[PDB]
Amino acid sequence: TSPVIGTPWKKLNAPVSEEALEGVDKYWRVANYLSIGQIYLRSNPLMKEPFTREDVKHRLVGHWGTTPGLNFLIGHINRFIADHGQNTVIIMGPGHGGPAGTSQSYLDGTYTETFPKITKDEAGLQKFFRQFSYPGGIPSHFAPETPGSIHEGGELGYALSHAYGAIMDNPSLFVPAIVGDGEAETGPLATGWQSNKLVNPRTDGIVLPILHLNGYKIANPTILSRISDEELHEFFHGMGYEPYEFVAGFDDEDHMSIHRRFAELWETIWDEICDIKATAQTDNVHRPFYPMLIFRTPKGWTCPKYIDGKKTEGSWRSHQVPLASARDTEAHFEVLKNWLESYKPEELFDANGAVKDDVLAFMPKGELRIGANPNANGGVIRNDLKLPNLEDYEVKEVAEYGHGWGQLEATRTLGAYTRDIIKNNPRDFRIFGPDETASNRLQASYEVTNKQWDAGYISDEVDEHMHVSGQVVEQLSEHQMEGFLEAYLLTGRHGIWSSYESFVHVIDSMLNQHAKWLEATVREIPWRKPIASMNLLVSSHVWRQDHNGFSHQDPGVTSVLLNKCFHNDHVIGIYFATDANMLLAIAEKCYKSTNKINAIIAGKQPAATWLTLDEARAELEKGAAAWDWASTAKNNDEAEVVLAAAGDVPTQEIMAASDKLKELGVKFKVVNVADLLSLQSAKENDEALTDEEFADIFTADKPVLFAYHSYAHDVRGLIYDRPNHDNFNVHGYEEEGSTTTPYDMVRVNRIDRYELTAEALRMIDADKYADKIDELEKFRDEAFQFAVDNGYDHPDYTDWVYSGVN
Amino acid sequence: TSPVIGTPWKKLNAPVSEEALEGVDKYWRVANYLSIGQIYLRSNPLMKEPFTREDVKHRLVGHWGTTPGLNFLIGHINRFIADHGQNTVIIMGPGHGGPAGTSQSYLDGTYTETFPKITKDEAGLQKFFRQFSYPGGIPSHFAPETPGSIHEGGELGYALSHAYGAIMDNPSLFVPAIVGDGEAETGPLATGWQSNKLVNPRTDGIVLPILHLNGYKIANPTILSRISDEELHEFFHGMGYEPYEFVAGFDDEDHMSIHRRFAELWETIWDEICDIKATAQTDNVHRPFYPMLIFRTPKGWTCPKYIDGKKTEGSWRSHQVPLASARDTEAHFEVLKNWLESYKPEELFDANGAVKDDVLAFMPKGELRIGANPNANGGVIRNDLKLPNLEDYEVKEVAEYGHGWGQLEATRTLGAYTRDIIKNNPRDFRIFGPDETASNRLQASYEVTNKQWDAGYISDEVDEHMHVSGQVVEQLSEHQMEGFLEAYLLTGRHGIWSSYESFVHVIDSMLNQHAKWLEATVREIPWRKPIASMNLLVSSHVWRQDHNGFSHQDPGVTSVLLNKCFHNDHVIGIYFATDANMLLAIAEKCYKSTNKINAIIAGKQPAATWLTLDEARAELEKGAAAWDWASTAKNNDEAEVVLAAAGDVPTQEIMAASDKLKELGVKFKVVNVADLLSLQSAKENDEALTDEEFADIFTADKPVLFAYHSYAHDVRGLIYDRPNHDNFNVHGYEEEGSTTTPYDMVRVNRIDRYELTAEALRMIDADKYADKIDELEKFRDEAFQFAVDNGYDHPDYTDWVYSGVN
Numbered sequence A, B: 001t002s003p004v005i006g007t008p009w010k011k012l013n014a015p016v017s018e019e020a021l022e023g024v025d026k027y028w029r030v031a032n033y034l035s036i037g038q039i040y041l042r043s044n045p046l047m048k049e050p051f052t053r054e055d056v057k058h059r060l061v062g063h064w065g066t067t068p069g070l071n072f073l074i075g076h077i078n079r080f081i082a083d084h085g086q087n088t089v090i091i092m093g094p095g096h097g098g099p100a101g102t103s104q105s106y107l108d109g110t111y112t113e114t115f116p117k118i119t120k121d122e123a124g125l126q127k128f129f130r131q132f133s134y135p136g137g138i139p140s141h142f143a144p145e146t147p148g149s150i151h152e153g154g155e156l157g158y159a160l161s162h163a164y165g166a167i168m169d170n171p172s173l174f175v176p177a178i179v180g181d182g183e184a185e186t187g188p189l190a191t192g193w194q195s196n197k198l199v200n201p202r203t204d205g206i207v208l209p210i211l212h213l214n215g216y217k218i219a220n221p222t223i224l225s226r227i228s229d230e231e232l233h234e235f236f237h238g239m240g241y242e243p244y245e246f247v248a249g250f251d252d253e254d255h256m257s258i259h260r261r262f263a264e265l266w267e268t269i270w271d272e273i274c275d276i277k278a279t280a281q282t283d284n285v286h287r288p289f290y291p292m293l294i295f296r297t298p299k300g301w302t303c304p305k306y307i308d309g310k311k312t313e314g315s316w317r318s319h320q321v322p323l324a325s326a327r328d329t330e331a332h333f334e335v336l337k338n339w340l341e342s343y344k345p346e347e348l349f350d351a352n353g354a355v356k357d358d359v360l361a362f363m364p365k366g367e368l369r370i371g372a373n374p375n376a377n378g379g380v381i382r383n384d385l386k387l388p389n390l391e392d393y394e395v396k397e398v399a400e401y402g403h404g405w406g407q408l409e410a411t412r413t414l415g416a417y418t419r420d421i422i423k424n425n426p427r428d429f430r431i432f433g434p435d436e437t438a439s440n441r442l443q444a445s446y447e448v449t450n451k452q453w454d455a456g457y458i459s460d461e462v463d464e465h466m467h468v469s470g471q472v473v474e475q476l477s478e479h480q481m482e483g484f485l486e487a488y489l490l491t492g493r494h495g496i497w498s499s500y501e502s503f504v505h506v507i508d509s510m511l512n513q514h515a516k517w518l519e520a521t522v523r524e525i526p527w528r529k530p531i532a533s534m535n536l537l538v539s540s541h542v543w544r545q546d547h548n549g550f551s552h553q554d555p556g557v558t559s560v561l562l563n564k565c566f567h568n569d570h571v572i573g574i575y576f577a578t579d580a581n582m583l584l585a586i587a588e589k590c591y592k593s594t595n596k597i598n599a600i601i602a603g604k605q606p607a608a609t610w611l612t613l614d615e616a617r618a619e620l621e622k623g624a625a626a627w628d629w630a631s632t633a634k635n636n637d638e639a640e641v642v643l644a645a646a647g648d649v650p651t652q653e654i655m656a657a658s659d660k661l662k663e664l665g666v667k668f669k670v671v672n673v674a675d676l677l678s679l680q681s682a683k684e685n686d687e688a689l690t691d692e693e694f695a696d697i698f699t700a701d702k703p704v705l706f707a708y709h710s711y712a713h714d715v716r717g718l719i720y721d722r723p724n725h726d727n728f729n730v731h732g733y734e735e736e737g738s739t740t741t742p743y744d745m746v747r748v749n750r751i752d753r754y755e756l757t758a759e760a761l762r763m764i765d766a767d768k769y770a771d772k773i774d775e776l777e778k779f780r781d782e783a784f785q786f787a788v789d790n791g792y793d794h795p796d797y798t799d800w801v802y803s804g805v806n
């Protein structure tokens, strides 16, 4: 679970010391200098004679506009941390404020600790400035390469979901969450403000949202800075916050008055938070209004007010670089030089180029430093789950009655397994869902926990399984669920969320950003320890969406996740749960895995159970497997056709087609694919099937009929250099469907058992089986006409049991 | 459970009709006339010529002062009931307003229905007037003889506890609870206002408290009518009420404006109650402010303003009779005659003496009438409990190991039994306790229900087993617990409360009033059906009160309840639970009994189990029994002494004395008394032991040593004419004790095993056993000196097991 770090929720009981404020003001100057040096300078960091245009980088990359505001806030937060011993993680929402994050880590000493070549002297400072956003250096954003980041904030709008995920079951953790005022215009951010209705001030930590109201986004004003101050305050009060406003930099107030004013307001806010935390030790049934800070400052604060007659400080014109080419004109170089000198670096750095002791003597030390807090490197906190014994949940009836027995709902099995994970791993495992946990049949967890709800309660007739604390969280937002879980994992804990398949697409871009985090971490950031995997139960899938119908039918999550499978990163798992015993085997592998995004595509409809758990574990280790109990070919040369399937509904239709083929005497081989990346090119993926293993399973030369759960294009693209790939005939979802019966869903997508039987006969000999083929095609129209007439599927479809069942 | 009666919680959605108000005004006139006729007249009810002083009763009994106010309220409540079809029971707090209750029942027709000689004509009216508070007639109060009463209100202060008990698990029931403003000065009433924190507006009914603020009690003003109106309103608002005030009769407003004003205010109050009930169908988690009515009217309203120069209307002088002897003076007779004529009875009664149709055409009909509502005759609602099978709870180990086995806490057994009663009888069985349910070990009921709590919730760390509805109610008030339960029983349901023994005395006077209700019901009121018994678990008794010590040691409940055992009423049960199996047998008998007060004196300390359930049921049927398995005499003539005991600690000491006597060779007989009234004179009590049964058990002539749980005076008084009673030697509590060890409690009261052994030897031969007697007395001082030295009782005391244990 989360470590208790420091002395949390302590009031100061004194004014902020004038010396600490002189610390904060020097911090802001030197962090601003070091932010500018990283953007503009390739050499001569301390502007020794001669400082000329040759010291300027040839291409200016990075963002000034948000940066001096972030440096201000970070300076004051560091003072706060050292004075109070508070366990603190910052969410840097305007993540293009990269130079502030790297400057912080350089000043707190964690940068040189982590990156020993970047020393705390003039040659290390030169390397520090050159490397920023440079070929072979470090990124422009607050990337996972930076000590202290858990959030790159490249794609905007997840700051608050990540902040609130971080503090769940983390009652000593304080998260100051800096939100762009442009970022507050996004969808995901806008709903993220309501997360305070889903956290509990006793059992969870505290988020302080900080609205970086600098007035501007890239080229536009921001909505929230142009509405009235009364509207802006009512807005935050309507969302359960008590808003505090700070305004600075729009007049000629000296910088030391600003710092005193801010430290006074910070400590007032903090006294309000400590009151909330102290009250919650007794009463955590009544939701407080949490503080939030509206930080109103000019964009690009302390850049030159006018460059070439255009307003730059307090404008969108300061967003990227205020000064656009200091290398090309003497005039513009002089502006850069005077700007760099306005921070007076002669007082900040000593003769050797180290930042002076009195600049940083207010800073926190040890694990309380922003770049050294374990919650910001949450792999160091994370332990293996205590997992229950997987055979306790095995469907034993396959071994009793035969492969293909029963009408179980496979996700109920996962639900019972996850219930006992939650029971064995209190405060360490969570379930998230967008109001779909019961619907996706995971509600056995309510026997051991509750849905965390901190809005109002009204009646025990409606409010079953809800409590102000609990390990299940539901809000109708895929962005919230994915974002909560992502930060729960990045801070060292574990969990799962579930979703209807077609709505996974809502968070495709969040999955992309989590995968780029993971890809960069496993390629090049070894000091960042492995975090628990992002586990996604994909249920209510396309084949059993014949009640919501056509516009809820999109299995396309698989195509998205296949674009993050390169360079042997192995950050993606794509798993088709064939039945409940395969779902168990998959779930245990995903629950033991680290540094991944695991998609688990499982049906929740009643379906057969095909495998025992020991067979499921064997198929899962390779990824695909022949089912010799289902083949009537007895090796690869007497097979006429290979019937392969990936997914529970393709498996059902292929197994029903193999029974009709067997009745015709045909010699075939049956294959199941549980793990989709096992089919990936053996050159590209060293966990995938070797080409010899692939040709034993599939064959060297026989026609393979392949029923696939998602778009056939996924498979055709993956097997492009596999042996015998020209003989594959992939059937997937093909954008057909309506609100209809289950048979009609498989029929219109050409994956029903009769079409698959017919396709196998056309592949074997379309001419000797011509009579029987015309017979199967006529039944397809007749079983559809039965559904229209009677209101339910034809009994030859619905009553079918595999012949292996005794 | 409670019947749903009528159309509850319906708004009127129209003004009160002017015709109904003329009904109410005629009701008030005729009820006032009939109230005065009952007090003053023995003949000539309609004052036919000649109406003289001979028609006046020789002795004036009864109360005028509260009556015209009650008649006003009752008239308006009857109009309300007929207009809304509301299920309604009235609690008449000023129960000395008897004539209002009898007048109501006479006007609603239920009186003549119930009492066929009191007809609705002039001769029935004559009998109606003469019988009131007259030799061989009916009582002065709102007695159980009156249709519509569930509360005599003789002893004041239980109106609100009874009102709130009535509405528990009775969600269609409306209870207008009329509270005396003098009665509001009592202890029990003052805490009764807080009961609205213990009821739930969805699962329970609604009480409307009506403060009958007439300004005066017997001879004094009332506190609540002499404080400021701002204080009086703040007071009721502080207790969770929304107070409404009505003021009338202190000016010359005509009576029809008063009725319109009142009906408008009544319907506003009722619209507020219907809103509460409608809201509670959705949100019953948030406690509403319930309405209450402050009814401010002159005491004795419509009596002559001045009699003999003394203010009478609006004074305490109208409390009993305004006019003190209308039979002795022509002047005072004329005052009575003009008073009777002011109601203008010529318009109220027709030529035959029936009340005219237009007086009563507004009245409710059927079961909605006050005197016909089944909640006011709750024996008609009551069914037998579904009781679980008693052998499921039997301590089986007596039969395995021997009599005297174990260290069980007997009340835990009752707790498990009562849990499954509650489970089988939902909404029909309640437990009450004054914050003592867990302490008296009855907390197995929390496995199936909750403590009903409707004040604020703060935290799951403190608020375990609480819910806004549930079948256990706790408030630290014996008056509330006894009063809640009493009305739950009178409205047809069942239950139990428990108490520490010494605090039963707190409600001695409530037990007295319930017993007088029951005594009058079983003697003479056959139309009033049997109600479930008042069951009281008396635990933490005097012998195991050596931790609270001396001032918590009072077993005297038994002496109080022995004063209500006359004339074969059988309304009292006094039971000593010898062990857990006897407690089961007792509890089942009490749970099946009707029309009783059952005291069940049971220990909750670890103690031996003496009897099997089949033996316990045999002893319980007779009440006392010989224990032939424990005697060493083999009939009555070879016994030298009879060792009798009543109660678990006397049984333990007598069984330990019998083992030491056996070791000496003595021939004795052991008797246990489970039911105290079995010893009562066989002439007085036809359920008690016959004199021949008594002398078989006790003997004709042997010394009986009798260890009794409570004061020896109880037993000595009961056996005064029994055979061999001069040979009894009763040992009870004798007002000795301190905070001490359990042995020291029995030692200082001369009931410990060593003193009892010694007393038996003095009774047999004090001279041949003189050595061993001096030995036992010296050990008593030595086992006390051990406790002082070591801090716990001597091992010969604590480690003793009966020799019957294998």
Ligand SMILES: Cc1ncc(C[n+]2csc(CCOP(=O)(O)OP(=O)(O)O)c2C)c(N)n1
Pocket: A065, A066, A094, A096, A154, A155, A156, A157, A179, A180, A181, A182, A183, A184, A186, A212, A214, A216, A217, A218, A222, A299, A319
């Ligand atoms: C989802 C998304 N769309 C577009 C962008 C491009 N972008 C980067 S910075 C930026 C402006 C950000 O504004 P604010 O949130 O206002 O940042 P700050 O001013 O503090 O620089 C935008 C639109 C983005 N990062 N994310």
Ligand SMILES: Cc1ncc(C[n+]2csc(CCOP(=O)(O)OP(=O)(O)O)c2C)c(N)n1
Pocket: B065, B066, B094, B096, B154, B155, B156, B157, B179, B180, B181, B182, B183, B184, B186, B212, B214, B216, B217, B218, B222, B299, B319
């Ligand atoms: C416990 C108790 N003590 C004393 C009395 C005697 N008593 C009877 S009526 C009465 C006055 C009652 O006053 P209120 O409650 O003011 O009645 P109302 O005016 O309506 O007649 C008193 C003191 C009583 N009935 N109960």
Ligand SMILES: [Ca+2]
Pocket: A180, A181, A182, A212, A213, A214, A215, A216, A217, A222
């Ligand atoms: Ca901005």
Ligand SMILES: [Ca+2]
Pocket: B180, B181, B182, B212, B213, B214, B215, B216, B217, B222
């Ligand atoms: Ca009064």
